[PDB]
Design a protein around this ligand. Structure first.
Ligand SMILES: [Cl-]
Ligand SMILES: [Cl-]
Ligand code: NA
Length: 130
């Protein structure tokens, strides 16, 4: 499913992402936008290290979910990577919460550093009623 901006904004708020571990809703929106374009079925194979990024938040199979084919990987979210490709983002959200529970926080995603950090991100939630 390809989420519409405000539709996604409201969904994340309901799932309790606003201010989770100090991260504003607008930052989560910026992350989803640059990682997948709000697309839940987005998958990206990294031929460089044999891992794959899954779903709306492009969560990596090396540490977070299990896809069985990534070498020396763990499954911190305790989920099959397939769970991260559903239209319902409840699981992807539970896993993203797990990711940011680590010391790096939102910085775990290099894309956030490149396109969201130190920028005016208000635009992602304007007019959405959140
Ligand atoms: Cl699962
Ligand atoms: Cl599994
Ligand atoms: Na894994």
């Amino acid at each position: 499913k390809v989420f519409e901006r405000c539709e996604l904004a409201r969904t994340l708020k309901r799932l309790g992402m606003d201010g989770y571990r100090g991260i504003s809703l607008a930052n989560w929106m910026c992350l989803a936008k640059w990682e997948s374009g709000y697309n839940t079925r987005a998958t990206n194979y990294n031929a460089g290290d044999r891992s794959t990024d899954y779903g709306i938040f492009q969560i990596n199979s090396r540490y977070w979910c299990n896809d069985g084919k990534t070498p020396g990987a763990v499954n911190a979210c305790h989920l099959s990577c397939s769970a991260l490709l559903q239209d319902n983002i409840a699981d992807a959200v539970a896993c993203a919460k797990r990711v940011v529970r680590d010391p790096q926080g939102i910085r775990a995603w290099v894309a956030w550093r490149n396109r969201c950090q130190n920028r005016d991100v208000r635009q992602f939630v304007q007019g959405c009623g959140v």
